[PDB]
């Protein structure tokens, strides 16, 4: 289609005394999980997590298994290095994380690339939007920025995201055999005072990118909306709600607006018995 993405999520969690770290990679095309590696098996393999990946040749799985084990090893070494860099005692449990990936528009060129790491759940180092320079999050990471600049690592990470990532994204999207439009309702709820909550629901939509906004008299709100982050419904679709507090009797001065890739035009709706 038009806007698409391929993203990988890497996590290692150490456990001194018990064994080597547990390392996991999870891949997503758009908002759908499609592959996974988990080092906590005897002979762990790169595996499909969707129907349209199950017919892919063995060589793809083998190659990505070896790349995943290499990443396991990198994460194991980085966890040790990070203990030194942050002057931490041994014996505790720690995490190392990486997220990378690409977004493309309709032309198949890279719109936006990502390459960033975290230690114990905190920013460590990230490739900037230019895919040319790094931002170190603290003094500890400043040495990594220096090493990676001297080695020219941004160029290689750049080349991956501009080439391999975007091209395999294109391949994955030809696999198998589409957008799910949201269905919206507005519910009304009582409160102690002479006011009422209007909750605007969007259900059954894919992909997850959506915009729910309320308006008063066709203009921007003065109050702040309450909302929940977009969330999986358990069948590969997503839901969201946004809400507003309004005077009892003035409900219909407020309108909910829903923007989604699937819709021909935005939905407009207001409370209605």
């Amino acid at each position: 289609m038009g806007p698409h993405s391929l993203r990988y999520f890497h996590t290692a969690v150490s456990r001194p005394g018990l064994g080597k770290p547990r390392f996991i990679s999870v891949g997503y095309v758009d908002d759908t999980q499609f592959v996974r590696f988990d080092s906590d098996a005897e002979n762990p393999r790169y595996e499909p997590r969707v129907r349209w990946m199950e017919q892919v040749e063995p060589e793809y799985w083998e190659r990505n298994t070896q790349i995943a084990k290499g990443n396991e090893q990198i994460f194991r070494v980085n966890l040790r290095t990070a203990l030194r860099y942050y002057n931490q005692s041994a014996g505790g449990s720690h995490t190392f994380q990486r997220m990378y990936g690409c977004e493309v528009g309709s032309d198949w060129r890279l719109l936006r690339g990502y390459e960033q790491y975290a230690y114990d759940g905190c920013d460590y180092i990230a490739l900037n939007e230019d895919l040319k320079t790094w931002t170190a999050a603290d003094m500890a990471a400043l040495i990594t920025k220096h090493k990676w600049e001297q080695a020219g690592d941004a160029e290689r990470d750049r080349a991956y995201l501009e080439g391999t990532c975007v091209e395999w994204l294109r391949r994955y999207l030809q696999l198998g055999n589409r957008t799910d439009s949201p269905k919206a309702h507005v519910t009304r709820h009582s409160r102690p005072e002479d006011k009422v909550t209007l909750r605007c629901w969007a259900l059954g939509f894919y992909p997850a990118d959506i915009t729910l906004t309320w308006q008063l008299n066709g203009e921007e709100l003065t109050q702040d909306m309450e909302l929940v982050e977009t969330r999986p419904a358990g069948d590969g679709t997503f839901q969201k709600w946004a809400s507003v507090v309004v005077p009892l009797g003035k409900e219909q001065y407020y309108t909910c607006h829903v923007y989604h890739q699937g819709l021909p035009e935005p939905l407009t709706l207001r409370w209605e018995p």
Binding site: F9, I24, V26, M99, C122
Partner: protein, 98 residues
Amino acid sequence: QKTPQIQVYSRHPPENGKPNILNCYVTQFHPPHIEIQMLKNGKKIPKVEMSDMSFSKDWSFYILAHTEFTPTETDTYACRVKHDSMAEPKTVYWDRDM
């Protein structure tokens, strides 16, 4: 250490006596170790299909527990979550009237 937020909800608007997916979405936590508990008037629900874990731009972890279930007027549901950031299990009941 980040505290897990918990959301409990169905796929479709809940109708008493109609097939539906209950969902317990546990998010924004760290470290990743977690045992999540889907319940029904206190008792455990067997064979709760777990999603794989992942994480957001602020690095904290996300996971979805979800089962099939037939809602009723009397029956309640909840999610108690076991995590290292808390003292004791944090409980969020299914607000269906929501």
